[PDB]
Every structure is written in C-alpha cells, then in structure tokens.
Amino acid sequence: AMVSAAEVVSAQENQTYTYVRCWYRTSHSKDDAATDWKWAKNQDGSDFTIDGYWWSSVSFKNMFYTNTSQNVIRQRCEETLDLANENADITFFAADNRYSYNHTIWSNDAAMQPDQINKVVALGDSLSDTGNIFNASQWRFPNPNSWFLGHFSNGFVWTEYVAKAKNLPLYNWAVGGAAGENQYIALTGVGEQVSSYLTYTKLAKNYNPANTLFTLEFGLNDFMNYNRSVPEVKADYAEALIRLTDAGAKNFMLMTLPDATKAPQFKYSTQEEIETIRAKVLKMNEFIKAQAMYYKAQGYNIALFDTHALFEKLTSAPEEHGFVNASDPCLDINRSSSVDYMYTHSLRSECAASGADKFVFWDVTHPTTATHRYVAEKMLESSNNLEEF
Ligand SMILES: CCCCCCCCCCCC(=O)O
C-alpha cells in the first residue's frame, strides 16, 4: 500500500500554508541560463499563500499538496514578475522562507474529474530531469549559471514543452546522472522513481492514475558506464511498466533511445567504447518497440516516438531541421568530465554568433532547449496532439 490509510488522513488533515518562489530567466536570450526568483504576490501587493499539507517519505524530500491549481499559481507568478520577456521560462515552488529548498507543489484533483488526461508524470534521466538531482546536490549539480535551474540544458526539457502545449501540470520523478561515470548511479534508478511516484501519489486527494499521462525514457546512463547490461536494462524497463500498469496507469508516451555516441561527449571516447554503446542502444530500441506493442495489444494508450531516428537525422543533416551545428556543444566545453557541471562556462564563438537555438547540443551530452522543443513538437505530431489519449 506504500502509506497506510491512517497515515494518509493524519498527513492530509495537518493543514497549514506556505509561500511561492517564482523563478525566471534573467536574460531575454536563451544563450544565458542564469535565473533569479521573487515571492508570488496577489494584485493588491499582499504575499500570495497556498493552503495545504506537507508530506515526505523516508527520503525526507517534502512535497506540498494544495487545492490551488497549477494554472492559478503560474498566473500569480506571471503577474508578480510582469516580465515582458518571451523567454522568462517561469517555474515555481513552495517555500516557507529564503532558507527553504525548492519544494514541488502537487495540485490535488477534484473528486469529479472528467475521464481525460489532466497531468503529466515524467520518469527517466537527464533528458527529462527538471530539478531532482539539482535539489539532491544542494543547488550545485548542474551549476545554475550555465545550466537552466537544475535542468541539463539552457532551458525547458521536452516533457515541459509537451505539458505546456497541452496546458497540463507536469510532475517530475526523472533524475539526472553523470554520462559515462558512476556518480549517483545507485540513486537515479527507474525502480526508485516508480517507488517514489507510488508513495507520494498515495498522499494526493482524488488521485485517479487513469488520468495521468506517463512519460518514460532511460537506459543511456547504464549503457554509458556499464552499470547494468542490456538484459538488466530491458528487465528494469519491463518492471517499471508492470508496476505502473498494475497501479492503474493507462496512458504512456514512450520513446526509443537516441544514439548518445553521436553527442560531442564521444569525441573523447575510443571507437571500441562507441561501437559497444551503439550496439546496446540498437538492442534496447527493438525491446522498447516490442514493449510498446505488448501494452498496446492489452488495450493501453501507447504513443511510441522514434527519438533514435530523429537524432540520426538531426546529427547527419542539422541544416534540414533548422540547426547550424550538431557536432559541438554550444558551451565552450572540450572534454567529457562530470567536474565541468560544477562551474560556469562561456559559449564557444560559433554558438555566440549563431545563438543557442541553432545548436543541437548545449553541453557535451545534453540537447539545447531548441532541440528539446523540436523533439516535443515531433512527438506531439506523431501522437496527433492527444489522439490515443
Ligand atoms: C544524440 C543525442 C543523445 C542525447 C543523450 C542524452 C543523455 C542521456 C542521459 C544519460 C545521463 C544520465 O542522465 O544519467
């Protein structure tokens, strides 16, 4: 059951209030990842507060549960900041004071919800993480001057673009790792993400898992550091889907893995290492397609997007997709060291000239926010903008 019914009522009845931290990109340019924050206000100038309750598992990572909708909170942030900036890329969190870390706000659903997708729940790695490893690392990994507030990019990741296009709240369980290295590998596992999603949603009011759109992508971390073999990663992926569908999940956005060996990171790897990872990716992608077919045959709503085929096109012919460069990071990083994520980096001259929206890669591994937007747009086109869901 994860949390007893008694524990749930006791936590839900422990009613209180908290404040809202409104984050925003300080520059009008997506070349600058730097952010700042302001407390949300009401139109009369008074502090905006939200009512609800706190809950943390043995993780001690506190989530605030409110009846106030994500749209109302976003609206308060937008009006408070009054930034005539198209690239403000506003995000928000619960915080009692300046000492507080960035707590996720869960907006409780109404008892009478229509049978329709009303939220996005993301699971995965640094292709989806919006702040979990950042929060875990105490706002250090990745550096907030060169990576957009805990996202491994210069802005929003594909899940945020998918959720925004559909005007849906996004709740993130994805956790960034370290490409080609062993840092955080016992903490980033999809098993722990599914367990966490199953524990925290038990505290939500009127939660109907049938109304959640689940996104899932992982396996590249394990293939890059040799932590889990192809069959071990296939088993982990199959387990995540078994556990989620057994817990009432009905809707999934699945994707094949892009060939990470096409990223700037692998300029510094040996050909032997590259061919090994490429082969694991190809093997995993056939399994992902088989899993999508398996759940579709059982009557689940599955949208499978071939991200692998898209990144093959993006890296071989960037000019056909609106990019000038798919071979270098936009940031002036010329090695593959996890240590670089702790520091500030200038843009390399070619990226300063063209703008970050014309580069496929932000750093040696991760796509820029323009690439994330393109992937989101291509996925939304393949799924005919909520067709099966
Ligand atoms: C060709 C583009 C490839 C994009 C690779 C994205 C990085 C995958 C995530 C692996 C690191 C991690 O987050 O644990």
Coordinates of C-alpha atoms and ligand atoms in Angstrom, one line a residue:
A1 CA 0.0 0.0 0.0
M2 CA 3.2 2.2 0.4
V3 CA 1.5 4.5 3.1
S4 CA -1.3 3.4 5.5
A5 CA -4.8 4.9 5.1
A6 CA -4.4 6.3 8.7
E7 CA -1.0 7.8 7.9
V8 CA -2.7 9.5 4.8
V9 CA -5.7 11.0 6.7
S10 CA -3.3 12.2 9.5
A11 CA -1.0 13.9 7.0
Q12 CA -3.9 15.4 4.9
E13 CA -5.6 16.8 8.0
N14 CA -2.3 18.5 9.2
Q15 CA -3.4 21.8 7.3
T16 CA -1.1 24.7 7.0
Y17 CA 0.0 27.4 4.4
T18 CA 3.2 28.2 2.5
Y19 CA 4.6 30.8 0.1
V20 CA 5.5 30.6 -3.6
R21 CA 9.0 31.1 -5.0
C22 CA 8.7 32.3 -8.7
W23 CA 11.8 31.6 -10.8
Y24 CA 12.6 33.2 -14.1
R25 CA 15.4 33.5 -16.8
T26 CA 17.1 36.9 -16.1
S27 CA 18.0 37.5 -19.7
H28 CA 15.8 37.8 -22.8
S29 CA 18.3 35.5 -24.6
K30 CA 18.2 31.6 -24.3
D31 CA 22.1 31.8 -24.6
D32 CA 22.0 32.8 -20.9
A33 CA 20.9 30.0 -18.5
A34 CA 21.0 32.3 -15.3
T35 CA 17.9 32.6 -13.2
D36 CA 16.5 34.6 -10.2
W37 CA 13.3 34.4 -8.1
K38 CA 10.7 36.6 -6.4
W39 CA 7.9 35.7 -3.9
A40 CA 4.5 35.4 -5.6
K41 CA 2.1 38.3 -4.8
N42 CA -1.6 39.0 -5.2
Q43 CA -2.8 42.0 -7.3
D44 CA -3.2 44.2 -4.1
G45 CA 0.6 43.7 -3.3
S46 CA 0.0 41.1 -0.5
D47 CA 2.0 37.9 -0.3
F48 CA 0.4 35.0 -2.2
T49 CA 0.0 31.9 0.0
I50 CA -1.3 28.5 -0.7
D51 CA -3.2 26.2 1.8
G52 CA -2.4 22.6 2.1
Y53 CA -0.2 20.0 3.8
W54 CA 3.4 18.7 3.6
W55 CA 4.5 15.1 3.3
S56 CA 7.8 13.4 2.8
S57 CA 8.7 9.7 2.7
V58 CA 11.8 8.3 4.4
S59 CA 13.5 10.3 1.6
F60 CA 12.6 13.4 3.7
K61 CA 12.0 15.3 0.4
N62 CA 9.0 17.5 1.2
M63 CA 6.1 17.9 -1.3
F64 CA 3.3 20.4 -0.6
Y65 CA -0.2 19.4 -1.5
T66 CA -2.7 22.1 -2.3
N67 CA -6.3 22.5 -3.7
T68 CA -5.0 25.6 -5.7
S69 CA -4.5 24.7 -9.4
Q70 CA -1.1 24.9 -11.1
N71 CA -2.6 27.4 -13.6
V72 CA -3.7 29.8 -10.8
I73 CA -0.1 29.6 -9.2
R74 CA 1.5 30.1 -12.6
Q75 CA -0.8 33.2 -13.2
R76 CA 0.2 34.7 -9.8
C77 CA 3.9 34.2 -10.8
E78 CA 3.4 35.8 -14.2
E79 CA 1.5 38.8 -12.9
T80 CA 4.1 39.3 -10.0
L81 CA 7.2 39.2 -12.2
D82 CA 5.5 41.3 -15.0
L83 CA 8.3 40.4 -17.4
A84 CA 7.6 41.4 -21.0
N85 CA 10.2 38.5 -21.7
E86 CA 9.0 35.8 -24.2
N87 CA 11.9 33.6 -22.7
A88 CA 11.1 34.2 -19.0
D89 CA 10.5 30.4 -18.8
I90 CA 8.8 30.8 -15.3
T91 CA 8.9 27.8 -12.9
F92 CA 7.5 27.8 -9.3
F93 CA 8.0 26.0 -5.9
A94 CA 6.7 26.0 -2.3
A95 CA 9.0 27.6 0.3
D96 CA 8.3 28.9 3.8
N97 CA 11.4 31.3 3.6
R98 CA 14.7 32.1 1.9
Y99 CA 16.4 29.1 3.7
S100 CA 13.9 26.7 2.0
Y101 CA 14.9 24.5 -0.9
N102 CA 12.7 24.2 -4.0
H103 CA 9.7 22.1 -3.0
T104 CA 7.3 20.7 -5.6
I105 CA 3.7 21.8 -5.3
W106 CA 1.2 19.0 -6.1
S107 CA -2.3 20.4 -7.0
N108 CA -4.9 18.0 -5.8
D109 CA -7.6 17.0 -8.4
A110 CA -11.3 17.5 -7.9
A111 CA -13.5 14.5 -6.9
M112 CA -15.5 14.9 -10.1
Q113 CA -12.8 14.8 -12.9
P114 CA -13.7 14.1 -16.5
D115 CA -12.2 10.9 -18.0
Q116 CA -9.4 12.9 -19.6
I117 CA -5.6 13.3 -19.2
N118 CA -5.2 16.1 -16.6
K119 CA -1.4 15.8 -15.7
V120 CA 1.9 14.5 -17.0
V121 CA 4.2 12.3 -14.8
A122 CA 7.8 12.0 -16.0
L123 CA 10.2 9.2 -15.3
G124 CA 13.7 9.0 -16.6
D125 CA 17.2 10.5 -16.6
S126 CA 18.8 13.9 -17.6
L127 CA 16.8 14.0 -20.8
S128 CA 13.8 14.7 -18.5
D129 CA 15.0 15.9 -15.1
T130 CA 13.6 19.4 -14.2
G131 CA 15.4 19.6 -10.8
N132 CA 15.6 16.4 -8.7
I133 CA 19.4 15.8 -8.8
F134 CA 19.9 19.7 -8.5
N135 CA 17.9 19.7 -5.3
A136 CA 19.6 16.5 -4.0
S137 CA 23.1 18.0 -4.8
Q138 CA 22.1 21.2 -2.9
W139 CA 21.8 23.5 -6.0
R140 CA 25.4 22.6 -7.2
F141 CA 24.9 19.9 -9.9
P142 CA 24.4 21.4 -12.5
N143 CA 25.8 24.9 -12.0
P144 CA 22.9 27.4 -12.2
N145 CA 24.9 30.0 -14.3
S146 CA 25.5 27.6 -17.3
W147 CA 22.5 25.2 -16.8
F148 CA 19.0 26.4 -16.5
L149 CA 17.9 26.0 -12.8
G150 CA 18.5 22.2 -12.4
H151 CA 17.7 21.2 -16.0
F152 CA 20.6 19.8 -18.0
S153 CA 20.0 22.3 -20.9
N154 CA 19.8 26.2 -21.4
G155 CA 16.0 25.9 -20.8
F156 CA 12.9 23.6 -20.7
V157 CA 13.2 19.9 -21.4
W158 CA 10.9 18.0 -23.9
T159 CA 8.4 16.9 -21.1
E160 CA 7.8 20.6 -20.1
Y161 CA 7.2 21.5 -23.7
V162 CA 4.7 18.5 -24.1
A163 CA 2.9 19.5 -20.9
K164 CA 2.8 23.3 -21.8
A165 CA 1.4 22.5 -25.4
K166 CA -1.5 20.7 -23.7
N167 CA -1.8 23.2 -20.7
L168 CA -1.1 20.3 -18.3
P169 CA 0.7 20.2 -14.9
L170 CA 4.0 18.3 -15.0
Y171 CA 5.2 16.3 -12.0
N172 CA 8.8 15.1 -12.4
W173 CA 10.4 11.9 -10.9
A174 CA 13.3 11.8 -13.5
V175 CA 16.8 12.1 -12.0
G176 CA 19.9 13.3 -13.9
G177 CA 23.0 11.1 -13.7
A178 CA 26.6 11.6 -14.9
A179 CA 27.1 10.5 -18.6
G180 CA 29.9 7.9 -18.8
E181 CA 30.6 7.9 -15.0
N182 CA 29.5 6.2 -11.8
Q183 CA 28.3 9.3 -9.9
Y184 CA 24.7 9.0 -8.3
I185 CA 24.0 5.6 -10.2
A186 CA 22.5 3.9 -7.0
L187 CA 20.1 7.0 -6.7
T188 CA 19.0 7.5 -10.3
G189 CA 17.3 4.1 -10.9
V190 CA 13.8 3.9 -12.5
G191 CA 12.8 1.4 -9.7
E192 CA 13.3 4.0 -7.0
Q193 CA 11.5 6.6 -9.2
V194 CA 8.4 4.3 -9.6
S195 CA 8.5 3.6 -5.8
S196 CA 8.6 7.3 -5.1
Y197 CA 5.8 8.1 -7.5
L198 CA 3.7 5.3 -5.9
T199 CA 4.4 6.6 -2.3
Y200 CA 3.8 10.4 -3.0
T201 CA 0.6 9.9 -5.0
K202 CA -0.9 7.9 -2.1
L203 CA -1.0 11.3 -0.2
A204 CA -2.8 13.1 -3.1
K205 CA -6.6 13.7 -2.8
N206 CA -8.9 12.2 -5.5
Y207 CA -6.0 10.8 -7.5
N208 CA -7.0 8.8 -10.5
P209 CA -4.0 7.2 -12.1
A210 CA -6.1 6.7 -15.4
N211 CA -5.9 10.5 -15.9
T212 CA -2.1 10.7 -15.8
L213 CA 0.0 10.8 -19.0
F214 CA 3.2 8.9 -18.1
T215 CA 6.5 9.6 -20.0
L216 CA 9.4 7.2 -19.8
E217 CA 12.9 7.1 -21.1
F218 CA 16.1 5.6 -19.5
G219 CA 18.9 3.2 -20.2
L220 CA 21.6 5.5 -21.6
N221 CA 23.2 6.1 -18.2
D222 CA 23.6 2.3 -17.7
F223 CA 25.0 1.7 -21.2
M224 CA 27.5 4.6 -20.9
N225 CA 29.1 3.4 -17.6
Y226 CA 28.5 -0.4 -18.0
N227 CA 26.5 -0.4 -14.6
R228 CA 23.6 -2.7 -16.0
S229 CA 23.9 -5.0 -19.1
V230 CA 21.3 -4.9 -22.0
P231 CA 19.1 -7.7 -20.4
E232 CA 19.3 -5.9 -17.0
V233 CA 18.2 -2.6 -18.5
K234 CA 15.4 -4.4 -20.5
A235 CA 14.2 -6.1 -17.2
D236 CA 14.2 -2.7 -15.4
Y237 CA 12.2 -1.1 -18.2
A238 CA 9.7 -4.0 -18.3
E239 CA 9.4 -3.9 -14.4
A240 CA 8.6 -0.1 -14.5
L241 CA 5.7 -0.7 -17.0
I242 CA 4.5 -3.8 -15.0
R243 CA 4.5 -1.8 -11.7
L244 CA 2.9 1.3 -13.3
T245 CA 0.1 -0.6 -15.2
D246 CA -0.6 -2.7 -12.0
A247 CA -1.0 0.6 -10.1
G248 CA -3.7 1.9 -12.6
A249 CA -1.6 3.6 -15.3
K250 CA -3.3 3.6 -18.7
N251 CA -1.5 6.3 -20.8
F252 CA 2.1 6.3 -21.9
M253 CA 4.4 8.4 -24.1
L254 CA 7.4 6.0 -24.8
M255 CA 10.4 6.7 -26.9
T256 CA 13.4 4.8 -28.5
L257 CA 16.8 5.9 -27.1
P258 CA 18.8 8.3 -29.3
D259 CA 22.3 7.1 -30.2
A260 CA 24.2 9.0 -27.5
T261 CA 27.5 8.1 -29.3
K262 CA 26.6 10.9 -31.8
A263 CA 26.9 13.5 -29.0
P264 CA 30.1 15.6 -28.5
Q265 CA 30.9 13.5 -25.4
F266 CA 32.1 10.6 -27.6
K267 CA 34.8 12.6 -29.4
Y268 CA 36.9 11.7 -26.3
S269 CA 35.8 8.0 -26.2
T270 CA 37.6 5.1 -28.1
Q271 CA 36.0 3.5 -31.2
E272 CA 35.7 0.2 -29.2
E273 CA 33.6 2.0 -26.5
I274 CA 31.5 3.8 -29.1
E275 CA 30.6 0.6 -31.0
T276 CA 29.7 -1.2 -27.8
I277 CA 27.3 1.6 -26.6
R278 CA 25.8 1.9 -30.2
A279 CA 25.0 -1.9 -30.3
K280 CA 23.4 -1.8 -26.8
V281 CA 21.2 1.2 -27.8
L282 CA 20.1 -0.6 -31.0
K283 CA 19.2 -3.8 -29.0
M284 CA 17.3 -1.8 -26.3
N285 CA 15.3 0.1 -29.1
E286 CA 14.0 -3.2 -30.5
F287 CA 12.9 -4.1 -27.0
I288 CA 11.2 -0.7 -26.4
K289 CA 9.2 -1.2 -29.7
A290 CA 8.2 -4.7 -28.6
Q291 CA 7.1 -3.4 -25.1
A292 CA 5.0 -0.6 -26.8
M293 CA 3.3 -3.3 -29.0
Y294 CA 2.8 -5.5 -25.9
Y295 CA 0.9 -2.8 -23.9
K296 CA -1.0 -1.6 -27.0
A297 CA -2.3 -5.2 -27.6
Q298 CA -3.6 -5.2 -24.0
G299 CA -5.7 -2.0 -24.6
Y300 CA -3.4 0.6 -23.0
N301 CA -3.0 4.0 -24.7
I302 CA 0.6 4.0 -26.0
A303 CA 2.3 6.6 -28.2
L304 CA 5.8 5.4 -29.3
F305 CA 8.1 8.1 -30.8
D306 CA 11.3 7.1 -32.7
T307 CA 13.7 9.6 -31.0
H308 CA 16.6 7.5 -32.3
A309 CA 15.5 8.1 -35.9
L310 CA 15.1 11.8 -35.2
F311 CA 18.6 12.3 -33.7
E312 CA 20.1 10.3 -36.6
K313 CA 18.5 13.0 -38.9
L314 CA 19.5 15.9 -36.6
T315 CA 23.2 14.9 -36.3
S316 CA 23.7 13.9 -40.0
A317 CA 21.7 16.8 -41.6
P318 CA 21.2 19.6 -39.0
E319 CA 20.6 22.2 -41.7
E320 CA 17.4 20.4 -42.8
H321 CA 15.9 20.8 -39.3
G322 CA 16.9 24.5 -38.5
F323 CA 20.3 23.9 -36.9
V324 CA 23.8 25.1 -38.0
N325 CA 25.8 22.7 -35.8
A326 CA 25.2 19.2 -34.4
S327 CA 28.9 18.3 -33.7
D328 CA 29.9 20.7 -30.9
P329 CA 28.4 21.8 -27.6
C330 CA 27.1 25.3 -27.5
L331 CA 29.1 25.8 -24.2
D332 CA 33.0 26.0 -24.6
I333 CA 33.5 22.5 -23.1
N334 CA 36.2 20.5 -24.9
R335 CA 36.4 17.2 -22.8
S336 CA 34.0 14.8 -21.0
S337 CA 34.4 15.4 -17.2
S338 CA 31.4 15.4 -14.7
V339 CA 33.5 18.0 -12.8
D340 CA 32.6 20.6 -15.5
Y341 CA 29.0 20.6 -14.2
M342 CA 30.1 22.5 -11.1
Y343 CA 31.4 25.5 -13.0
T344 CA 30.4 28.5 -15.2
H345 CA 31.3 28.2 -19.0
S346 CA 31.2 30.8 -21.8
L347 CA 29.6 29.9 -25.1
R348 CA 32.1 28.9 -27.8
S349 CA 32.4 31.6 -30.5
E350 CA 30.3 29.7 -33.2
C351 CA 27.4 29.5 -30.7
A352 CA 27.6 33.1 -29.6
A353 CA 27.5 34.0 -33.3
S354 CA 24.5 31.8 -34.3
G355 CA 22.6 31.7 -31.0
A356 CA 21.9 28.6 -28.8
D357 CA 18.7 27.9 -30.7
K358 CA 20.8 26.8 -33.8
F359 CA 22.9 24.2 -31.9
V360 CA 21.7 20.7 -31.3
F361 CA 23.8 20.3 -28.1
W362 CA 24.1 22.6 -25.1
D363 CA 26.9 20.7 -23.4
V364 CA 28.9 17.5 -24.4
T365 CA 25.8 15.3 -23.8
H366 CA 22.6 17.2 -23.5
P367 CA 20.4 18.8 -26.2
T368 CA 19.7 22.5 -26.1
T369 CA 16.2 23.7 -25.3
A370 CA 15.6 24.3 -29.1
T371 CA 16.3 20.6 -29.6
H372 CA 14.0 19.6 -26.7
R373 CA 11.3 21.8 -28.2
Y374 CA 11.8 20.1 -31.6
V375 CA 11.6 16.6 -30.1
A376 CA 8.4 17.7 -28.1
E377 CA 6.8 19.1 -31.4
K378 CA 7.7 16.0 -33.4
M379 CA 6.2 13.7 -30.6
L380 CA 3.0 15.8 -30.4
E381 CA 2.7 15.5 -34.3
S382 CA 3.2 11.6 -34.1
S383 CA 0.5 11.3 -31.3
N384 CA -1.7 13.8 -33.4
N385 CA -1.8 16.1 -30.3
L386 CA -3.6 13.7 -27.8
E387 CA -5.2 11.2 -30.3
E388 CA -4.9 7.8 -28.5
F389 CA -5.0 9.6 -25.1
Ligands
LIG1 C1 22.4 12.1 -29.8 C2 21.8 12.8 -28.5 C3 21.9 11.9 -27.3 C4 21.3 12.6 -26.0 C5 21.8 11.9 -24.7 C6 21.1 12.3 -23.5 C7 21.7 11.9 -22.2 C8 21.1 10.6 -21.7 C9 21.2 10.5 -20.1 C10 22.4 9.8 -19.6 C11 23.0 10.5 -18.4 C12 22.1 10.5 -17.2 O1 21.2 11.4 -17.1 O2 22.2 9.6 -16.3

